[PDB]
Design a binder for this molecule. Structure first.
Ligand code: NA
Length: 240
């Protein structure tokens, strides 16, 4: 997250860190959202590589013991069947991870609530992106979980020629694009939390930014629209 602020450690208890085994250690690669005690929602592109993955819930500082972490292996990966890794712009950038164990819930570990199917945010709706991704274009990962305020940019605007044009689909949410605040590499797969009727819900799964940089004016961060995938999510969980 470029232009973020440190999150309070109990603000976003559905945020997870998806990590891969790297020699004798583990490295953060992506975010995700805990949606059942044994299921995480992330981006498909995060699990394209043939790596050994684990999920960390209750994480705050990737570089220090927080006293709240639970570590759990990924047992099964179910990518959306229409995902195509060389065409992120087509959409379908979503995957579900079944965890090897069910995590224990507490003030640091909670299920993300999802929007009702079909819900579309009005332009300029208030949202936060969260993650441990790069803090500058071509920078380094955050240590502590970051948040940035990214209001939505509706389809009519986002798909206009000075924004994303044809690359943005109605199955995506755009947010930000002010040139200061954005998602960045390492935030992929994590949540966009939007405040609706008094309650934050996870409306987005972070999918892509501009090849020209993270915080680029009129290139809002693009997220998979969770509300387009409610039936898919329910169908996967019920058949696994
Ligand atoms: Na930690």
């Amino acid at each position: 997250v470029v232009g973020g602020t440190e999150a309070q450690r109990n603000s976003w208890p559905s945020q997870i860190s998806l990590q891969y085994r790297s020699g004798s250690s583990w490295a953060h690669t992506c975010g995700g959202t805990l949606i059942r005690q044994n299921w995480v929602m992330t981006a498909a592109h995060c699990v394209d590589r043939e790596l050994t993955f684990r999920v960390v819930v209750g994480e705050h500082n990737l570089n220090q013991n927080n006293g709240t972490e639970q570590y759990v292996g990924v047992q099964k990966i179910v990518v959306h069947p229409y995902w195509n890794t060389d065409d992120v712009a087509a959409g379908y950038d979503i995957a579900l991870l079944r965890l090897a164990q069910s995590v224990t819930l507490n003030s640091y570990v909670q299920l993300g609530v999802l929007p009702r199917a079909g819900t579309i945010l009005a332009n300029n709706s208030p949202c936060y992106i969260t993650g441990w991704g790069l803090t500058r274009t071509n920078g380094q990962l955050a240590q502590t979980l970051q948040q940035a305020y990214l209001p939505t940019v509706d389809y009519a605007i986002c798909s206009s020629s000075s924004y994303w044009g044809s690359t943005v689909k109605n199955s995506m949410v755009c947010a930000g694009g002010d040139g200061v605040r954005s998602g960045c590499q390492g935030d992929s797969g994590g949540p966009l939390h939007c405040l609706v009727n008094g309650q934050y819900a996870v409306h987005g799964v972070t999918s892509f930014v501009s090849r020209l940089g993270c915080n680029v004016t009129r290139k809002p961060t693009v997220f998979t629209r969770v509300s387009a995938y409610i039936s898919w999510i329910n169908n996967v969980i019920a058949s696994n």
